[PDB]
Amino acid sequence: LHKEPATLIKAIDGDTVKLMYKGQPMTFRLLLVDTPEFNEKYGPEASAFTKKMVENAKKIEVEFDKGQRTDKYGRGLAYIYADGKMVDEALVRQGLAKVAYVYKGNNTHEQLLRKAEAQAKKEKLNIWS
Ligand SMILES: Cc1cn([C@H]2C[C@H](OP(=O)(O)O)[C@@H](COP(=O)(O)O)O2)c(=O)[nH]c1=O
Ligand SMILES: [Ca+2]
Numbered sequence: 375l376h377k378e379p380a381t382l383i384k385a386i387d388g389d390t391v392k393l394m395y396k397g398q399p400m401t402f403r404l405l406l407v408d409t410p411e412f413n414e415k416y417g418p419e420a421s422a423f424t425k426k427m428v429e430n431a432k433k434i435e436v437e438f439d440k441g442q443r444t445d446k447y448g449r450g451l452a453y454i455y456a457d458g459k460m461v462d463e464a465l466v467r468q469g470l471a472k473v474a475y476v477y478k479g480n481n482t483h484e485q486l487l488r489k490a491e492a493q494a495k496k497e498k499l500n501i502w503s
Pocket of ligand 1: 403404405406407408445446451475477480
């Protein structure tokens, strides 16, 4: 896989962000995770966590997987990095997302994320508390 440039336009919630990619605004849905909706338990903390990560970053990057690059809603499907740290993984490591939506062909980072989830759960963090 390859990292490509993007710039933040706006934080949305725990697992969606609006980025400018190839000069066009698009909403990205983070691969292989599910955050709670803002209205649900840990939803606000997930949203805040992603927001801080993306807003504090000097360099945002998009990494597409091998599969589908857009979903049925028009959202970009990619892993998102903030100064080299994957947001998708970080949310899972902190117990603020579950590994989820694992589809054939877009699952390169599955086992990385599962390992993070196991550690969050062992620590009883947030969702796992
Ligand atoms: C993360 C992800 C979501 N989706 C679709 C499946 C779900 O459809 P439904 O809307 O029909 O439930 C929805 C979940 O996204 P959200 O968790 O953002 O709601 O987005 C994909 O198709 N591919 C993906 O990789
Ligand atoms: Ca969600």
